[PDB]
């Protein structure tokens, strides 16, 4: 259940900001 919206958007947003 690593499929988690909080976990996935956290990484995507971090990439968007990086």
């Amino acid at each position, epitope marked *: 259940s690593l499929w988690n919206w909080f976990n996935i958007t956290n990484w995507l*947003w*971090y990439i968007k900001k990086k």
Partner: antibody
Amino acid sequence: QVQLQQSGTDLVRPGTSVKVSCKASGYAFTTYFIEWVKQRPGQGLEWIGVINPGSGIPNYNEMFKGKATLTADKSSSTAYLHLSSLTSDDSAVYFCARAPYYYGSSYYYFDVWGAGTTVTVSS
Amino acid sequence: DIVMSQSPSSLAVSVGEKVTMSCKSSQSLLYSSNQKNYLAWYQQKPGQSPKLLIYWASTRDSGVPDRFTGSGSGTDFTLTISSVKAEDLAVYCCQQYYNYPFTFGAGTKLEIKR
């Protein structure tokens, strides 16, 4: 020089709502997570939830879903904890904490804590 | 939810002696990929806010004196004060950041033996 400044004590009647603020300074507000922890007098620490201040998306402890609401105002670098339907059980000290954001992950320790906000519920 | 057990709840220590504190998790904290334990140790003095001492079970936070040491892996973890000082009297609690919801231990309260 990292600092988490929380608001003062709240004396509220049961059934009302309260909003605790946590103002950050000394770093980029949106590059760290904001955690909220509840501690009842003479008891262990209780994790409430966490919010990504940049994306705005929170993650809640199931026990606090419906009672706690997490927001963040990027313009003022301030995180908020909203508590509804207050009762005697909500009387506690509420800490806001900061957690790093390395590699886009949130599973991190809490490196900086605020002074805590005392909330007292009584009629 | 992971359950953090800390024994004993209170401990009477003498200044200069080696102190050991135990923390047990109901679930393993060792991530297989990076082989890192998602375990932290905090110090909380009466009336003050928690202060971070050890993270990754054994990594010392900056500024923390070298007399604090974390050990263990998986489910059994340990905090050691090689030579306790008077200013070390506080409650020490462990925390897992391995799985939501993050959970803390009840803490171990340090007091002066007499």
